[PDB]
Structures are given as C-alpha cells and as structure tokens.
C-alpha cells in the first residue's frame, strides 16, 4: 500500500478518545465506549480496504447519533489542519470533529486486511493513488453526509486558496455535502477562501471553481456569500 498504515495503538486511542469525549460532553455519557469501538472495528476488519461502503459504518452511525448547532455549522473540506487555526473558527463554529465520531477519527489512518481479520499497521490505501474507497475516505463521506443533511441557516465552508482547484467537485465536500444541503432548511452557503499567503492580494471569489459553486448552489435554491481571508 502507498499510504501510511493504521496509527499505532489505534484501538487503544480510539477508546481513550471516546472516554474523554464523554467526560467533557456530559450530555453524551450514555455511550458504550466499547460498543462504539466494536462497531467501528467491524466496519473494516474482514473487509478489503478498497471495498468499504457507507453501509459498513451503519452499525457505528447508529451509536454516534448526535445533535448539532445546525446554524453554527462549518462543513468538512479536506483541510482540517489549515482551518482549526483561526480563533474565529474553533470558537464560533462547529467542525465535524467536535462531533463524537469526528472527534474519534480526527488525524487517524486505519485499515485492515481480509485474508486475515487483523488491522494493518504497515501500509494503507492512498485514496488518490490506490483505490478510492479506503475505510478513512469512506468513513468521512459517511459522517459528513449526515452533517450536511443537518445544517440550517447559514452554513459555512473553508477552501484552500492555494490548491490548484479551490473548489473540487469530486471532493467529499463537492460530491457529498453540497447535494445534501436542504434549501428548505439552509438559507446560504458562506464560503471562505483562504489566501495561501499575504502578498497574494487577489479576489479569489473570482476563480472559476468558486463560481462553479456559486452556480451549483443556486440551482439548489440556496444563496451564496463568498469571502477572502488569511
């Protein structure tokens, strides 16, 4: 496999994460940290890491079920490291990784094998280079498909103003989240384009990718507010 393998003491850390998340977030607590872990684990051990479906996570979704400040939401764009960086974001909005499941799998890579039934700590599929349906790729499509169906009022999103394709139509965001924003529920998509450096003046609200999003969003009955930042 061309990607890095499951992060060490994986099942050990996914449990400690669920432990902590339930102290801090007491209006959870009722959660069976093991049954959660058991549900997670069962989605991809025994399954070949290029053949995982959003269904396999159905088990764990049921247990992850949660409730969110639907009007304070900030959707999953690949780039969680660039964004967690603005005190405006962490503070004033709800990243998919302040949810439970989001919390557990943030910064982790994982996959198993199938001719056995044991995690693989050596290598894992690289969504771009190898098959595109690795467990991680699919986990995130799964939990964010939910996130998107849950959003109301103004829903935000953050794009790299460096990527060659600022708005990628195939991205988890482009392909999953965008088409699950309900207009009967969401007033506006406010997008924040993040200039890859000062010096780079340049209204990126202009870039056509962005405009393809303006256009798409509008065929959905949702309004579009674009904004630049650093």
């Amino acid at each position, epitope marked *: 496999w061309s990607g890095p393998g499951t992060t060490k003491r994986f099942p050990e850390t996914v449990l400690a994460r669920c432990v902590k998340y339930t102290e801090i977030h007491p209006e959870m607590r009722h959660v069976d940290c093991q049954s959660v872990w058991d549900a997670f684990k069962g989605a991809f051990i025994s399954k070949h890491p290029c053949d995982i479906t959003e269904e396999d996570y159905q088990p764990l979704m049921k247990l992850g079920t949660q409730t969110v400040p639907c009007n304070k939401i900030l959707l999953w764009s690949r780039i969680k490291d660039l964004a967690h960086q603005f005190t405006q974001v962490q503070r004033d909005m709800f990243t998919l990784e302040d949810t439970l499941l989001g919390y557990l799998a943030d910064d982790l890579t994982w996959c198993g094998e199938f001719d056995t039934s044991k995690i693989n700590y050596q290598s894992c599929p690289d969504w771009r280079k190898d098959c595109s349906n690795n467990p991680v790729s699919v986990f995130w499509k799964t939990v964010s498909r939910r996130f998107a169906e849950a959003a109301c*009022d103004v829903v935000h999103v953050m794009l790299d103003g460096s990527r060659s394709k600022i708005f990628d139509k195939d991205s988890t965001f482009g392909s999953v989240e965008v088409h699950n924003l309900q207009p009967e529920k969401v*007033q*506006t998509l406010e997008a924040w384009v993040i200039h890859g450096g000062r010096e780079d003046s340049r*209204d990126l609200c*202009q870039d056509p990718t962005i405009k393809e999003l*303006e*256009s798409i969003i509008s065929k959905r009955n949702i*309004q579009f*507010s674009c904004k630049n930042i650093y």
Partner: antibody
Amino acid sequence: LVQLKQSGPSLVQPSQRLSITCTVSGFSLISYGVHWVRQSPGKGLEWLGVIWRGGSTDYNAAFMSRLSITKDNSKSQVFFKMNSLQADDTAIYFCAKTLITTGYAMDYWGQGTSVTVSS
Amino acid sequence: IQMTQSSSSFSVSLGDRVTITCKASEDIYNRLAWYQQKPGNAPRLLISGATSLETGVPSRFSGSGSGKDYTLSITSLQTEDVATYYCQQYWSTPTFGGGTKLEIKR
C-alpha cells in the same frame, strides 16, 4: 461607504424607452448583485429584475417581454431599460446592493427616481 | 406566492411595544426580509432570513416567525421609528406585502 446613485429621465412619453442608470460607489459589481424594484402607489412594491455579479439575469415573469438590465463593471453602473411604456409604468424605480455575493435581501438601496409616464 | 401584511395602519403611543404580521400563500422556509420605509426616502434593510438583524439597526428590533407567519417587533418604541413596514419573500420570485403604516399616539 456604499452609495447607489441613479439618474436619467423622470418624465417619459407613453410607449417610449425608459432608461435609468444606477451608479455605485464604495463597492463593485463583480462582488455583489443588483436588484431593481419599483413602487407605484397603486401596486405597492414589485420586483422587476436582477443583474447578478455573474452577469446573468432573471426577470419578472411579466416584464421579461420589455426588460433589459445590463451593466458596465469598469465604471460601476447598471442599465435599466424598459420598452413600450404606459400609464401605470409610473412609479419610483430603485436599485439595491444584494446583501452578500448572491442573495435577495438588499442592504444599500438607491435614491429612487420618480418617473411619470405622460404626453 | 403572495405576501399579505394584514393590518395596514397602526397607532400606539411612544414607549409602547408594537408588532406586525406577514403571511404567505405557502411555506417560505424563512426566505423573508423586513424593510422600513420612511416616506421621502429609500427603504431600509432591517432583517433578513426572518431573524438576522443588521448593522446600525437598534437592538430593540425583533425578528421572529415560522412556517407561514412572520413578525416584526419593537420593544420600547421610540420616535424615529415611524414608517410603512414592508415584508419581502424570496423563496421564489420576490413578492412583497401590502404595507403597514405606523402613527404615534399624540
């Protein structure tokens, strides 16, 4: 400081061309969209049309016949143009900054131009 | 889709707590905006998407309402808050409301 300053006719002969010119300051037409509403004492307020940041336009079912909004971004001004006028085409016509890039609530409105259609 | 503000005129004394109504042919799913027009002047944006306020606009102003029935409200009415009060829906092609004029009780 956002301003939308019209100018044009005011008095216009029946079945002519109405042609107002909205001219915007403290902002740009590639960033926001521009709506036209008119107010006649009889019909209250009515949405005529809209010239997006994009450039595309959407028109009110009724006037899509005789309507033509268009803009000149270099000089930040929008061009209303209505054909075969009439008695009731008498009203004040306003423009407005779309609040946000692409939305309908309009934050900063134009002064309005009272138009009277008569020989 | 049509906007019917009902009440067309109102008078209540200063410091009084006023309220207005808007209702649509059909569910507009919050696509609604309140505008405050003082005659002899262009109309003013007050509230958008049913409840989100706006700069300048005093904290006195209340955006509420849901489904088909929306609502403007001032807490302790002041003086320079007299005008016709209009309502815009934008779930489909924008339509407005009759109007609702305000008069002090002198």
